[PDB]
Design a protein around this ligand. Structure first.
Ligand SMILES: NC(=O)C1=CN([C@@H]2O[C@H](COP(=O)(O)OP(=O)(O)OC[C@H]3O[C@@H](n4cnc5c(N)ncnc54)[C@H](OP(=O)(O)O)[C@@H]3O)[C@@H](O)[C@H]2O)C=CC1
Ligand SMILES: CCOC(=O)CCCCCOc1ccc(OC)c(Cc2cnc3nc(N)nc(N)c3c2C)c1
Length: 206
């Protein structure tokens, strides 16, 4: 009664698995953010009458996002942090672990609640990504690959695109990415600001 959905991780990362610098992103990509927004917000139309997605994030990611952009708009935010500390949010949820967030979500958004959960995303940062990679329900990574070894000080925790992980994690066809995300998605290299990047979807078997 708690294991009733897969998790999806969404991340932008360099070819060296770099995700962050000096507690922020070290690139400026508005289209890449709009992608993150489309994907994390997308609900099939028939369901969209009553259903919403969830974004789970570490408290350091929470702080990292500019004040203007919180909570992240038409999704259910849950911030994961290990001491019932002092957050202070407009209906904004707190849990001490990934599984405690899941239980809090299923208790709050039940068979009867007006709002119903479609998909659940883990949106960072490295510490929460590491918990999600270890979680038996994670089966999908939405990766934006950034083809530049931009200096980072925080890294994604498991080299899921490298040969050692290649019997577990498989890159899907672009048409399957678009089928999952519900829209046409740019295919191949996109250039904003001196770097190529591209959108990928990886899966593993549960
Ligand atoms: N490129 C991308 O797509 C993304 C990049 N980022 C970047 O990542 C950096 C943040 O990464 P990181 O430093 O790991 O920060 P995290 O966001 O993972 O936050 C870490 C804090 O969240 C809490 N936490 C995380 N995992 C758990 C867990 N399993 N159980 C309990 N509490 C947990 C802890 O809080 P406490 O200390 O409260 O106990 C921990 O100290 C920033 O640079 C941000 O810009 C973030 C998201 C996406
Ligand atoms: C109120 C007006 O709102 C508007 O007009 C719309 C602006 C939309 C901004 C909100 O979305 C943002 C904004 C900034 C961010 O860090 C600056 C992030 C964190 C981020 C970014 N890329 C990301 N990209 C990927 N592939 N994955 C992530 N996990 C991710 C993550 C967590 C998200």
């Amino acid at each position: 009664m708690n294991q009733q959905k897969s998790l999806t991780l969404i991340v932008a990362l360099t070819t060296s698995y770099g995700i962050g610098r000096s507690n922020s992103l070290p690139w400026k990509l508005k289209k890449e953010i709009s992608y993150f927004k489309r994907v994390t917000s997308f609900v099939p139309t028939f369901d969209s009458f009553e259903s919403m997605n969830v974004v789970l994030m570490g408290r350091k990611t929470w702080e990292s996002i500019p004040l203007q952009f919180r909570p992240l708009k038409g999704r259910i935010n849950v911030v994961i942090t290990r001491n019932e500390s002092l957050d202070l949010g407009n209906g904004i949820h707190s849990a001490k672990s990934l599984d405690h967030a899941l239980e809090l979500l299923y208790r709050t958004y039940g068979s009867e609640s007006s709002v119903q959960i479609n998909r659940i995303f883990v949106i960072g940062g490295a510490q929460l990504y590491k918990a999600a990679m270890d979680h038996p329900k994670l089966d999908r990574i939405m990766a934006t690959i950034i083809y530049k070894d931009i200096h980072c000080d925080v890294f994604f925790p498991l080299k899921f695109r490298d040969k050692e992980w290649s019997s577990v994690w498989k890159k899907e066809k672009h048409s399957d990415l678009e089928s999952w995300v519900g829209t046409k998605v740019p295919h191949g290299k996109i250039n904003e600001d001196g770097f190529d990047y591209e959108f990928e979807m990886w899966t593993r078997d549960l």
